[PDB]
Amino acid sequence: KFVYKEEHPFEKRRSEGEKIRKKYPDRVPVIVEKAPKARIGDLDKKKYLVPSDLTVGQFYFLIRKRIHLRAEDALFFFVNNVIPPTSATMGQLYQEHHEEDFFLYIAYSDESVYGL
Template sequence: FNHSNSFAFFNGINNNLFYNIVEIHFCTVIIVERALRSRAPDLDKKKYLVPSDLTVGQLSFLIRQRVSMRPEEALFFFVNNSLPPSSSPLSAVYEEHHEEDLFLYMTYSNESVYGA
């Protein structure tokens, strides 16, 4: 997403209004994309505005509901090629890893588990 949309594009949008809404409602802006070599299904949308107190595990549950995955498949999220703890609030992950455009970019991948 960040490669196909430049920072200049987002600067052209009324960012003051956008970021004020984010700050007032204590939300985190996340761009979620499928990892390059993943066989996980694609999401119908990539941009999410989520509550800052949402954890990585809760986000995983929400994303898992949006894609049709078999029960024996696990879903993993990566931020800057690292795996954040599932109990970590997204606000903490955002503070540590957000980009200069103030978005948090996450990728997801699936893996077969339980001997499947």
């Protein structure tokens, strides 16, 4: 679903994810990639290490900058096809939605429905 998963075998991702969680347990490792059909800027770096207290809204501010989004432009995150609340912390998202490789996966779109 994620290009990160096609280029990196599961065992490699999982070993990396376990190590990153051990070294920085107060932080969340995140893979961010554009959702299919999204009409929006490409992201230059996909792998992030974020404070667990960072909110989804603060992460939006950071991602919007990197993709050069205008003030009128919408940005939406999806984790397992669900839009997380902008007030949620990245740690809350990680607990409920991390994958078996110990990464949290976020798709982003200009559309409020994933893959629309």
